Design a protein around this ligand. Structure first.
Ligand SMILES: Cc1cn([C@H]2C[C@H](O)[C@@H](COP(=O)(O)OP(=O)(O)OP(=O)(O)O)O2)c(=O)[nH]c1=O
Ligand SMILES: Cc1cn([C@H]2C[C@H](O)[C@@H](COP(=O)(O)OP(=O)(O)OP(=O)(O)O)O2)c(=O)[nH]c1=O
Ligand SMILES: [Mg+2]
Ligand SMILES: [Mg+2]
Ligand SMILES: [Mg+2]
Ligand SMILES: [Zn+2]
Lengths: 645, 242, 456
RNA sequence: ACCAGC
DNA sequence: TTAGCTGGTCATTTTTTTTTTTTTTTT
C-alpha cells in the first residue's frame, strides 16, 4: 500500500503539463520524490504497485487525480495508462461516510480553523484539524512576489515549476498519511483483527463492511458520468431568454402606472421612491393602503406574502384585482430569468466548448445518504407542471448529440422507480401487521387509489399529502394541502391512522429504541440520548438530528441505498453483456437525480436492452438484501428529457 | 460568493443570515447588511441624490451601479456622469442638463469610456454612441452584461476606439449600435445590428424593445460597404450596355 | 532620475527571483537588487565601467516601466566589469537572460549582455568594437521573433568576422526554456552553433546534396517561357508588373485573372481603381467568348442570350470585384477565401509609399496570399522612351526607390508603339528571389481581333 | 423569508 | 408542540522635372 500525491498546472478540464509527484510506501518508508522529467518513472512505479497486487491511496483520486494521469500519460508521452478501480482508493470518499457530520460538531473547534474552513472535507482543512500544517503555498507565494515586487496576476501559480512546490507536495502527502491512519483507526467500519496496510485488493474490500465498497463504486461511476456531461441546446434557451426578457419589461411599465410612487423619509429629508414589484415590502404597503386585511401573522409585525395569499386577496378597486396577477407573473418571470441566464450559476455560464454541461454531484452530502448536486444544480430545473417548464426541459435533451461517425442524433431512455419510500415503509412494518399491507401496493397503483379514497384533485396532491401525513406533520400543514381547516386536518389524520394501526406501533418502537428520556422546556427541549445513530441497511451509522424526524431518517436513508446499488448494478450487467460505456461506445449516463436515471444510447435496440436490464438490476437489488416487498420500476424512451420525465 | 449560514442577531433567525468570502453578512429576514475647470465635484457637496428618469425609464439601481447622479447645486438640476479607470478611481466628470451645458471637469483623456471599471471578461459587448441607450441596455439586461459606451460622440470614433485596442482584444464578439462603422477592430469580431427606429430608446418607448434584444443575441457580421461580388451585378451590367 | 540610488537611502536587499527562476547568488554576483522607495517595490540593475565604478542604474517597476538615473552611455554593458577576456562569450538580448545563463553555467563562462535591446543594438555594438578584440568566440543568443532576426541580421556588419556564431532556441528566449525544463538543450546551443553565411557566401562543402537536388510548381502564367524560368507564382509572393503608359498592363493582368478563375477554380478578388465596375465585367465577358465586346456598337445591342454568357462564366461565386483599403483586402482574404488579390494602381493610394509597402508586405507575410501590384515607371532623362523599345532597368521605379527592396518578382513588357508593328511584346524578368535567373522570357502577339495574348 | 426539485 | 433533504437569492527628414555649361566611350 502506497500513498501518492500529484501536482499539475491546472484543473482537469484543461490540463496539459505534469509538475511533480511524491510517493510514500508502507514497506520501505521512503519519501520517493519525482521531478518534471521523471514522469515515466512515476508511471512505472504506479504500474509496479498495481502489478504486484497492491492498493494506491490518493486523496480526491476518483474525480481529479487518476483521470489527470490518464490524460497526461496520453497527451504528453503517447502511452496508455489505466488504473483498475479495485486498486485505487480515496481518503475523501472515506471521510464523507465516516465523518458525515461536521457542521454539528465543528463548533467548539472554531477558535484552529480560520472560519472559511468551517465544515470542509478538503485536504487543507484536515491539516488544520490534525494540528499538522506548515504554511500554505498560495499565501507564501503571494507574500514572496510582494516581497520581490513583481505583481500577482491571476491567482495562477502552477504555471512554472520551482522548489517550494515539491516541499508543499511533501507536506501534502504527510497530511494524507496522517488522515489515512485516523480513518483506518475506526472500529465500526474496519475490525481491529487485521492490519490494513499490507492486505491485498481481495482482502481489503471483502474483509470489511459493504458500505466501504458500494461508496467507492458509486464515487467511480458518478465521477465517470460527471466526465461524460449533459448535452445542452443553446439556441433554444437564447430564444427563451429573448422571449421572456421582453415580458418583465412590459409587466413593470404596465404596473408602475397603476401603483404610483411616493415620498419616503430618508428639515425632514424625503425621497421619491417608486414601486419595485420584486420587493415584498412595497406590495405589502400598497396592499395595506388599498383596503386589504391579512389575517395571517407569521412575523410579529408583518404579514406573510407568497403565492398562497396572493390568490386569496380581494380589494375594492377592480384595477388592483387584475394587477395582482401581473405581480405574480412578474415574480415568476424574474425567478425564471435569474435561474436560466442571468444568475451567477446560470445555465449559459457552465456550457463547455463541446456543447455540454458538467455539474458536480456529491454522492454523500446529506446526513441520510442522499446525493447533492451543485455547480449548477441539475436536480432543480422546473418540471412540466410549472409554467415555462417544458421549454426549459426540452433544451436538456440527448438528441442534441449528433454522432461523430455517422452524423445522426441519439436516443434517450429514462428509468424511474415507483413507490420507493412508501414501499420501504411496507418493508419495515411488515413484522407488525404480518405483511397484509405489502399486498395492496402490489395490487394496482397506490397513489391513484389513495386519491380516490381521499377525494384529492390531483395525483401530485395525493402524493404530497401521503408523505406529509407520514413524516410527522401538525394539525394544519396537511389541511393546508386542500386549503381547509384543522377540522379536516384532524379527520384525515384519523382516517389514515385508523386504516392500518401499525404506523404508531412502529413509531413507538423507534422511540423505545433510540430515546429514553426527554425533559420538556416551554421554549426548548432537553433530551438525554441513548443512541444518537441508526444502523442502516449496510451497517453505516446514520446520524439523527431531531427525535421527531427519526422515521424520516429511517425511511429515506434506507431508500437512497437501494437506488445507489441499483445504479451500479445496471452498468455491471451492461458492461458484462458486451457493450461499451462512454460517448465512443453505445451508452452513457447523463444525470442521476434522487430517484430516476437518464441514460443516452446510440440505437433503439440498445435502448430496449437498457430498459430491459434495469428491471433485472432492480430485482437483484431487491433479492440481495431480502426485502419483504417486491421492487419494480418503469422506463420511458424519447428524444429529450421532456417526454422522458 | 455564498459559503454558508450563520444565526442572525437582529431578527433572531438561524438560517436567514448568510456569510460570504468578502467578509460581509446578509440577512434575508430582517434585510440588514453589515460589514477648463480641473475640479472634481464631490458627491456630498453638490447635494448628490440617486433619482430616476421617468419620461425615458431608468431604475434607481442602474444609476447606483453606473455612476449617473443628479445634483441639486445652486437651485438647478445637473446630471453628472463619472468616468473611471481600471484601478477604480474617479478620472473625469460630465455635466448634462436641459440646456446641454456641457462642463467637462478633470483630465478627459482621448480614450475615455463609460462603464469600463467593472467589466473585463466575457464574450459579447454592446457599444453605443450616447449614455441613455447604454443605460437602456443595462435596464433590459439588469446590469450584469458587459456594455460600454463612447464618451466622445459618433463623429470621433477613429480616435477613442483606435486607442483602446488591448481592452477590446480580451473579448470574442463586439456588437455596435452606432447609427440606425469602424475598421480598426480585428476582423471576424465586428457585428452591426439594424433597428427599425432611431436608437434604442425609441424602441424602448414604443414597444419595440424585444427587437433590441433579438439584435443583441442574433446580430449579423458587417460586410464592409461596396465589396459587391460579381454575381449580384446583372442589372447594373444590363442597363450599362443598353 | 535624481541621483544614483544608494542601498542605505533606499533600503537595499539582495534576494532571489522565484517567479523568474534566478537564485540570490546570481543577483549577488551581478548587482541586481530591489529598493523600497515610494511604497511600491522597485527592481533595479547596476551598470559598471571598465574600472568598476558605479555609473548607471536601470529602474523597473511591477508594470514594466523604464527609469534611467541619468546620463546613459553607449559603452556600458550589463556584465562587462566582471570579465576582461576569455575564449567564449555569450551575448543575450536582455538582463534576465544573462542571469539565466550565469545560473545554468555555475558562473564559469564570461557572459555579458546588452543595455538597449533589439531596438538600438547597432549603436551599442558599433562603438564597442575595441572591447571585442580580446575575445576568441562570440555566441549570439537572441529572441525567436522578427525583431531578434532583424537584430542578428543587422549586427553582421559591426562585429568581427570569423569568430561569431549564432544559436537558436525553441522558446522566446532562454528564460522560458529554463522554466520549461529545457536545461539540456541550451548547453548544446552554447557549445555548438552555426556560422553567419550572410546572404551571398556559399561554401563549396555545403553542396553535398544541393547539386543532387539540382540534378533531380505553383500557379502558372498564360502566354508562352515565364513559368519555365521563375517556376510560377507561390503563396506569399508580391508580383510586380511595371511597364510604360499604354503598354498593356491591365490587359495582361486581366488575362491572368481570367485563366485563374475558369481553369484553376480559385477565388480571385479583383480591385480596379483605374475604371468602374460596369466595364471590367464586360471586358471579361468579351475576353472569354473570343469576341471583343466594348469596341463594337452593333454587337452590344444585337445580343440583348446575354444571361447565358453571364452565367457561363459568372455562374459560380468565383470572382469578387470592388468599387482603409487593407481592411477590405483582409476581408477578401479571410471572409471570402480568395487566393489572388490584384491591385491595379498604387500611386493614387516618400513616406506614404514606404509605409504602404511595409504594410502590404506584412499582410502578405501574415496571410499567405498571391498578391499582384501594378505601378509605373520613371521618366528617362536621355535617349528614347520606354514606348519605342527601350529595355526597362531595375532602377526606374516610380516612387521612393524602395519598390524593389520589398518585392519578390518583377515582370516588364516592352513593345515598339510608333514602329513597324505594335503587336509583338517582349517579356523581361527583372528579379526572382527563388530561381535567381533574369532576362528575356518570350514573345507574344496581341491578335487585335480577339484579345488573347497568344504566343509566337 | 421566498422559489424549484425529489 | 414542530412534513423532511438540498440549492440559489442580496450589498458600499528624402523623394520627381527644367534648364546653363565642362568633359568621355559608343553607336
Ligand atoms: C414528492 C415527495 C417524495 N419524497 C420521497 C418519497 C418518494 O418515493 C421519493 C421520490 O418521490 P416521487 O418519485 O415523486 O414519488 P413516487 O416514486 O412514490 O411515485 P411515482 O414514481 O409512481 O410517480 O422521495 C419526499 O420525501 N417528499 C416528497 O414531497
Ligand atoms: C499590349 C497591347 C495592348 N493593346 C490595346 C489593349 C488596350 O485596349 C490598349 C491599352 O492597353 P491597356 O492595358 O488598357 O493600358 P493600361 O490601362 O494598363 O495603362 P496605364 O494604367 O498605365 O494607363 O491597347 C494592343 O492593341 N496591342 C497590344 O499589344
Ligand atoms: Mg491531491
Ligand atoms: Mg418515482
Ligand atoms: Mg491600366
Ligand atoms: Zn436578521
Amino acid at each position: 500500500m502506497i500513498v501518492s500525491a500529484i501536482a499539475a498546472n491546472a484543473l482537469l478540464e484543461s490540463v496539459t503539463k505534469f509538475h511533480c509527484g511524491v510517493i510514500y510506501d508502507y514497506s520501505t518508508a521512503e519519501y520517493v520524490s519525482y521531478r518534471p522529467s521523471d514522469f515515466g518513472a512515476y508511471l512505472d512505479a504506479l504500474e509496479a504497485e498495481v502489478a504486484r497486487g497492491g492498493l494506491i491511496v490518493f486523496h480526491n483520486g476518483h474525480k481529479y487525480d487518476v483521470p489527470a494521469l490518464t490524460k497526461l500519460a496520453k497527451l504528453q508521452l503517447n502511452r496508455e495508462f489505466h488504473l483498475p478501480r479495485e486498486n485505487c482508493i480515496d481518503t475523501l470518499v472515506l471521510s464523507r461516510l465516516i465523518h458525515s457530520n461536521l457542521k454539528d460538531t465543528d463548533m467548539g473547534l472554531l477558535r484552529k480553523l480560520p472560519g472559511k474552513r468551517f465544515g470542509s472535507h478538503a485536504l487543507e482543512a484536515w491539516g488544520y484539524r490534525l494540528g499538522e500544517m506548515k504554511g500554505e503555498y498560495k499565501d507564501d507565494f503571494k507574500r514572496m512576489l510582494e516581497e520581490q515586487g513583481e505583481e500577482y496576476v491571476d491567482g495562477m501559480e502552477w504555471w512554472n515549476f520551482n522548489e517550494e512546490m515539491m516541499d508543499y507536495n511533501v507536506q501534502d502527502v504527510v497530511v494524507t498519511k496522517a488522515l489515512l491512519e485516523k480513518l483506518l483507526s475506526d472500529k465500526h467500519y474496519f475490525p481491529p483483527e487485521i492490519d490494513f496496510t499490507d492486505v491485498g485488493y481481495t482482502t481489503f474490500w471483502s474483509e470489511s463492511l459493504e458500505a466501504v465498497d458500494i461508496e467507492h463504486r458509486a464515487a467511480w461511476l458518478l465521477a465517470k458520468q460527471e466526465r461524460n456531461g449533459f448535452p445542452f441546446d443553446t439556441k433554444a434557451i437564447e430564444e427563451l431568454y429573448v422571449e421572456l426578457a421582453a415580458r418583465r419589461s412590459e409587466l413593470l411599465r404596465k404596473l408602475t402606472e397603476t401603483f404610483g410612487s411616493w415620498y419616503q423619509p430618508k428639515y425632514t429629508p424625503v425621497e421619491h421612491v417608486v414601486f419595485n414589484p420584486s420587493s415584498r415590502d412595497h406590495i405589502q404597503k400598497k396592499l395595506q393602503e388599498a383596503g386589504w386585511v391579512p389575517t395571517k401573522y407569521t412575523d410579529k409585525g408583518a404579514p406573510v406574502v407568497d403565492d398562497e395569499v396572493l390568490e386569496g386577496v380581494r380589494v375594492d378597486d377592480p384595477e388592483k384585482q387584475a394587477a395582482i396577477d401581473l405581480i405574480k407573473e412578474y415574480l415568476m418571470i424574474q425567478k425564471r430569468i435569474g435561474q436560466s441566464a442571468e444568475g451567477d450559476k446560470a445555465w449559459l455560464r457552465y456550457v463547455a466548448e463541446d456543447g455540454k454541461i458538467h455539474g458536480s454531484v456529491n454522492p454523500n452530502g446529506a446526513v441520510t445518504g442522499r446525493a447533492t448536486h451543485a455547480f449548477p444544480n441539475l436536480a432543480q430545473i422546473p418540471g412540466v407542471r410549472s409554467p415555462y417548464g417544458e421549454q426549459c426541459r426540452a433544451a436538456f435533451g440527448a438528441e442534441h448529440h449528433l454522432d461523430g461517425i455517422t452524423g445522426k442524433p441519439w436516443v434517450q431512455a429514462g428509468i424511474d422507480a415507483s413507490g420507493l419510500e412508501l414501499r420501504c415503509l411496507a418493508h419495515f412494518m411488515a413484522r407488525f401487521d404480518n405483511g397484509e399491507y405489502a399486498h395492496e401496493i402490489l395490487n394496482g397503483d397506490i397513489h391513484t387509489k389513495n386519491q380516490i379514497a381521499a377525494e384529492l384533485p390531483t395525483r401530485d396532491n395525493a402524493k404530497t399529502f401521503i408523505y406529509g401525513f407520514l413524516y410527522g406533520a401538525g394539525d394544519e400543514k396537511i389541511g393546508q394541502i386542500v386549503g381547509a381547516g384543522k377540522e379536516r386536518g384532524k379527520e384525515l389524520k384519523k382516517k389514515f391512522l385508523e386504516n392500518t394501526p401499525a404506523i404508531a406501533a412502529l413509531r413507538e418502537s423507534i422511540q423505545q429504541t433510540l430515546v429514553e428520556s426527554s425533559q420538556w422546556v416551554a421554549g426548548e427541549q432537553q433530551v438525554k440520548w441513548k443512541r444518537r445513530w441508526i444502523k442502516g441497511l449496510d451497517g453505516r451509522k446514520v446520524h439523527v438530528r431531531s427525535p421527531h424526524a427519526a422515521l424520516n431518517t429511517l425511511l429515506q436513508s434506507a431508500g437512497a441505498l437501494i437506488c445507489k446499488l441499483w445504479i451500479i448494478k445496471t452498468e455491471e450487467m451492461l458492461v458484462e453483456k458486451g457493450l461499451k460505456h462512454g460517448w465512443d461506445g453505445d451508452f452513457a449516463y447523463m444525470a442521476w437525480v434522487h430517484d430516476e436515471i437518464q441514460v443516452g444510447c446510440r440505437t433503439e435496440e440498445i435502448a430496449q436492452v437498457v430498459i430491459e436490464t434495469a428491471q433485472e438490476a432492480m430485482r437483484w437489488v431487491g433479492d440481495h438484501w431480502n426485502f419483504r416487498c417486491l421492487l419494480d420500476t418503469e422506463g420511458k424512451m424519447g428524444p429529450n428529457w421532456a417526454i422522458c420525465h | 460568493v455564498f459559503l454558508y449560514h450563520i444565526p442572525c442577531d437582529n431578527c433572531g433567525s438561524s438560517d436567514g443570515n448568510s456569510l460570504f468570502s468578502d467578509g460581509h453578512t446578509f440577512c434575508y429576514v430582517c434585510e440588514k447588511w453589515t460589514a477648463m475647470t480641473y475640479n472634481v465635484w464631490n458627491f456630498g457637496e453638490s447635494n448628490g441624490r440617486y433619482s430616476a428618469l421617468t419620461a425615458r425609464g431608468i431604475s434607481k439601481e442602474t444609476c447606483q451601479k453606473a455612476g449617473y447622479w443628479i445634483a441639486k447645486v445652486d437651485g438647478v438640476m445637473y446630471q453628472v456622469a463619472d468616468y473611471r479607470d481600471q484601478n477604480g478611481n474617479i478620472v473625469s466628470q460630465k455635466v448634462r442638463d436641459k440646456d446641454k451645458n456641457f462642463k467637462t471637469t478633470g483630465s478627459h483623456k482621448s480614450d475615455a469610456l463609460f462603464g469600463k471599471h467593472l467589466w473585463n471578461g466575457g464574450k459579447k459587448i454592446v457599444v453605443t454612441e450616447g449614455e441613455i441607450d447604454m443605460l437602456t441596455v443595462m435596464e433590459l439586461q439588469d446590469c450584469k452584461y458587459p456594455v460600454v459606451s463612447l464618451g466622445h460622440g459618433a463623429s470621433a470614433a477613429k480616435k477613442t476606439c483606435a486607442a483602446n485596442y488591448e481592452y477590446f482584444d480580451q473579448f470574442e464578439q463586439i456588437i455596435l449600435m452606432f447609427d440606425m462603422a469602424a475598421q480598426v477592430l480585428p476582423a471576424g469580431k465586428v457585428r452591426v445590428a439594424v433597428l427599425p427606429c432611431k436608437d434604442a430608446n425609441e424602441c424602448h418607448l414604443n414597444g419595440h424593445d424585444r427587437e433590441i434584444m433579438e439584435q443583441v443575441w442574433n446580430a449579423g457580421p458587417w460586410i464592409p460597404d461596396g465589396v459587391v461580388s460579381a454575381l449580384s451585378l446583372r442589372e447594373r451590367i444590363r442597363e450599362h450596355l443598353s | 532620475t535624481y541621483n544614483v540610488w544608494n542601498f542605505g537611502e533606499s533600503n537595499g536587499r539582495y534576494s532571489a527571483l522565484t517567479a523568474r527562476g534566478i537564485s540570490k547568488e546570481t543577483c549577488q554576483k551581478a548587482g541586481y537588487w530591489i529598493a523600497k522607495v515610494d511604497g511600491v517595490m522597485y527592481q533595479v540593475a547596476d551598470y559598471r565601467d571598465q574600472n568598476g565604478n558605479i555609473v548607471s542604474q536601470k529602474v523597473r517597476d511591477k508594470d514594466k516601466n523604464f527609469k534611467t538615473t541619468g546620463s546613459h552611455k553607449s559603452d556600458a554593458l550589463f556584465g562587462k566589469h566582471l570579465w576582461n577576456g576569455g575564449k567564449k562569450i555569450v551575448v543575450t538580448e536582455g538582463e534576465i537572460d544573462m542571469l539565466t545563463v550565469m545560473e545554468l553555467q555555475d558562473c564559469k563562462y564570461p557572459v555579458v549582455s546588452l543595455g538597449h535591446g533589439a531596438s538600438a543594438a547597432k549603436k551599442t555594438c558599433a562603438a564597442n568594437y575595441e572591447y571585442f578584440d580580446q575575445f576568441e568566440q562570440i555566441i549570439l543568443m537572441f529572441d525567436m521573433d522578427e525583431a531578434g532576426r532583424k537584430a542578428v541580421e543587422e549586427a553582421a556588419q559591426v562585429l568581427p568576422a570569423g569568430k561569431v556564431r549564432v544559436a537558436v532556441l525553441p522558446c522566446k528566449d532562454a528564460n522560458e526554456c529554463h522554466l520549461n525544463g529545457h536545461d539540456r538543450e541550451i548547453m548544446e546551443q552554447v557549445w555548438n552553433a552555426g556560422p553567419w553565411i550572410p546572404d551571398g557566401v556559399v561554401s563549396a562543402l555545403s553542396l553535398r546534396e544541393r547539386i543532387r537536388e539540382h540534378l533531380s510548381v505553383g500557379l502558372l502564367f498564360s502566354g508562352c517561357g515565364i513559368n519555365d524560368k521563375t517556376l510560377g507564382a507561390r503563396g506569399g509572393e508580391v508580383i510586380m508588373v511595371t511597364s510604360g503608359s499604354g503598354m498593356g498592363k491591365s490587359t495582361f493582368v486581366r488575362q491572368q485573372a481570367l485563366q485563374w478563375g475558369t481553369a484553376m477554380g480559385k477565388k480571385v478578388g479583383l480591385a480596379m481603381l483605374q475604371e468602374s465596375v460596369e466595364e471590367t465585367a464586360e471586358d471579361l465577358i468579351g475576353l472569354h467568348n473570343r469576341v471583343r465586346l466594348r469596341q463594337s456598337d452593333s454587337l452590344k445591342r444585337e445580343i440583348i442570350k446575354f444571361d447565358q454568357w453571364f452565367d457561363e462564366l459568372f455562374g459560380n461565386d468565383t470572382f469578387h470585384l470592388y468599387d482603409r483599403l487593407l481592411a477590405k483586402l483582409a476581408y477578401m482574404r479571410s471572409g471570402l477565401g480568395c487566393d489572388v488579390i490584384i491591385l491595379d494602381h498604387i500611386s493614387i493610394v516618400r513616406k506614404m509609399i514606404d509605409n504602404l509597402m511595409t504594410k502590404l508586405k506584412g499582410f502578405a507575410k501574415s496571410t499567405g496570399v498571391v498578391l499582384v501590384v501594378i505601378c509605373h515607371l520613371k521618366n528617362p532623362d536621355k535617349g528614347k522612351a520606354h514606348e519605342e523599345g527601350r529595355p526597362v532597368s531595375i532602377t526606374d521605379l516610380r516612387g521612393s526607390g524602395a519598390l524593389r527592396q520589398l518585392s519578390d518578382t518583377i515582370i516588364a513588357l516592352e513593345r515598339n508603339q510608333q514602329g513597324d508593328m505594335p503587336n509583338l511584346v517582349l517579356v523581361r524578368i527583372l528579379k526572382c528571389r527563388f530561381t535567381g535567373d533574369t532576362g528575356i522570357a518570350g514573345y507574344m502577339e496581341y491578335n487585335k481581333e480577339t484579345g488573347w495574348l497568344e504566343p509566337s
